């Protein structure tokens, strides 16, 4: 209960890059974990989407041009080298890694990232129920 | 800088769903039928805090309370804790009798 949003941000981003280069059973075990952390600390929904970049129809071309200048001048400020999780600027970067894991190939992985695409309905997942998944087990499940 | 604890939503008990964010005695009264003093006696027979909400009270004491509330005879529970034809005939009869009087 005493963790900074910067801390949860750093761990979320590092686990995102490991999902970017990870085998699928690790994906199965890790994306309910990111859901549960964003459920606990709801302030990371800014990195799941920064709505400052969403354009409304009901606004002036002045603000449209402001959005264009922001879109061209934007640069990702995340640092992967730094060991300090309070100094890694992980709170100003999104999960393109999890957008790609949305465009994974396996169907169950595709559904378990549609759970990111959908609104945040429920709160717990029982990671001890999502944890025991290996190649032999998923092969036997698909064959049965 | 971490601390750590020692939650569950609406639970089901004998074809009846019972909520979590209220106290235990009112949970057992939303159980269909039984009373407030019976819930008090079941709770203080289980020897728990009476102020805790149903999100607490972990599964071992939960099944203990379910066992006591399902088998009361093993726990010395006292017995104050459980829980047109003639119309047509009289219509026809009084009608035809007073009809005959009306004719005479």
């Amino acid at each position: 209960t005493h963790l900074s949003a910067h801390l949860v941000a750093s761990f979320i981003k590092k686990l995102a890059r490991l999902t970017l280069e990870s085998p699928p059973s690790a994906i199965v075990t890790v994306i309910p974990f990111i859901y549960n952390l964003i459920r606990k600390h709801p302030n990371c929904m800014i990195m799941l989407h920064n709505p400052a970049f969403i354009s409304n129809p009901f606004q002036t071309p002045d603000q449209v041009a402001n959005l264009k200048t922001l879109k061209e001048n934007y640069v990702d400020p995340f640092d992967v080298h730094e060991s300090d999780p309070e100094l890694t600027h992980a709170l100003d970067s999104s999960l393109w890694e999890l957008a790609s894991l949305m465009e994974h190939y396996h169907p169950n992985v595709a559904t378990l990232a549609k759970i990111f695409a959908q609104p945040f309905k429920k709160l717990s997942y029982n990671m001890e129920d999502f944890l025991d998944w290996n190649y032999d087990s998923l092969l036997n499940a698909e064959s049965s | 800088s971490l601390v750590v604890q020692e939650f569950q939503h609406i639970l089901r008990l004998l074809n009846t769903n019972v909520d979590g964010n209220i106290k235990i005695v009112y949970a057992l009264t939303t159980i269909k039928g039984v009373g407030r003093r019976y819930s008090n006696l079941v709770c203080k027979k289980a020897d728990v805090d009476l102020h805790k909400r149903a999100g607490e009270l972990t599964q071992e004491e939960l099944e203990r309370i379910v066992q006591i509330m399902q088998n009361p005879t093993h726990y010395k529970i006292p017995a104050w804790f459980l829980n047109h034809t003639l119309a047509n005939n009289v219509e026809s009869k009084l009608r035809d009798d007073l009809e005959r009087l009306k004719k005479i």
Binding site: S4, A5, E86 | -
Partner: protein, 52 residues
Amino acid sequence: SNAYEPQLELTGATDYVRTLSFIPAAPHLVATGSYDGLIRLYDTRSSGSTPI
């Protein structure tokens, strides 16, 4: 008395404001301890959007 709107909002912090303290002599000066360190000191008769 007017409990519908914040009489004076106070922003300019970064992450998880969880402590604050008024100061005895100054009845207008609010110290506010955030969670990234960086204890802010605001003066309420100013704008208050920025710490002093």
